[PDB]
Ligand SMILES: [Cl-]
């Protein structure tokens with residue numbers, strides 16, 4: 576298992592514009608298009624993102640390409656972030672995948688706000704971090720995915736994904 580396969584399980588793949596769990600226009604493998612209610616604003620962003628007139632639909636390769644950019648940006652955002660970097664540097668390979676996943680879903684800003692959990696992760700207090708991570712809107716809104724990520728943090732293994 577690796578970050579790509581992990582996120583592909585959590586996000587799914589859709590070749591036509593769809594609405595995410597929050598109701599926003601998304602396409603491919605969790606690629607957020609816009610927070611705007613307009614389907615046209617969404618089609619516009621999509622065409623801009625792909626470099627062609629897509630009429631709201633893309634092929635697998637296009638979805639994969641977006642996904643490759645998005646993971647890359649997630650990692651780079653973590654490395655550029657003063658609060659996230661030290662956490663990431665301190666973690667083992669599996670757990671790093673768990674942080675990348677949160678970042679991809681919720682953005683650098685949002686993860687960076689989990690101040691207390693971040694401090695627990697850095698200290699390697701697994702069980703406590705898992706408890707603290709659960710007291711969040713994140714966990715209440717997408718409990719199955721949150722549980723998988725949290726288990727990854729607690730255990731340091733890919734069990735929740737097998
Ligand atoms: Cl883009």
Ligand SMILES: [Cl-]
Pocket residue numbers: 716717718719720721
């Ligand atoms: Cl869920």
